[PDB]
Amino acid sequence: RRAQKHRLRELKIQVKEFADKEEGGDVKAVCLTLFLLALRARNEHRQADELEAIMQGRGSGLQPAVCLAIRVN
DNA sequence: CGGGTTTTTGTCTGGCTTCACACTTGATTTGCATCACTGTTTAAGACAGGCCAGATC
Numbered sequence: 568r569r570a571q572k573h574r575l576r577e578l579k580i581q582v583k584e585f586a587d588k589e590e591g592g593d594v595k596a597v598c599l600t601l602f603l604l605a606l607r608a609r610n611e612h613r614q615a616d617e618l619e620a621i622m623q624g625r626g627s628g629l630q631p632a633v634c635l636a637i638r639v640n
Numbered sequence: 641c642g643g644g645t646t647t648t649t650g651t652c653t654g655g656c657t658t659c660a661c662a663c664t665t666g667a668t669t670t671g672c673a674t675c676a677c678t679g680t681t682t683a684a685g686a687c688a689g690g691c692c693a694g695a696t697c
Binding site: 570574 | 647648649650
């Protein structure tokens with residue numbers, strides 16, 4: 568952890584200054600879409616969409632009507 | 641060869657943070673057992689008498 572901190576502090580300062588100046592310090596959504604598109608580049612739409620969900624926040628499970636629909640159909 | 645340059649760690653004392661967590665008590669959920677009910681014979685194959693029928697002395 569400390570290892571990768573050292574390894575990447577240069578990119579850290581780079582991206583933080585550039586994103587803070589560009590969009591007004593909203594590094595959250597900037598880096599969000601950054602990693603989204605970067606991971607989609609290698610055709611990981613599965614992981615990209617589940618990460619879109621995890622950040623969006625929604626429906627980890629199902630509600631009883633849907634489970635009933637499944638075991639009936 | 642043993643000595644020296646990387647990655648990797650310890651490391652600072654502050655203020656920050658999210659969140660587990662104390663301590664009841666009943667209203668829920670969830671796990672795991674029970675429960676009552678269903679199918680409605682043979683089919684090949686070995687051995688033994690027993691009866692009869694045809695052979696034989």
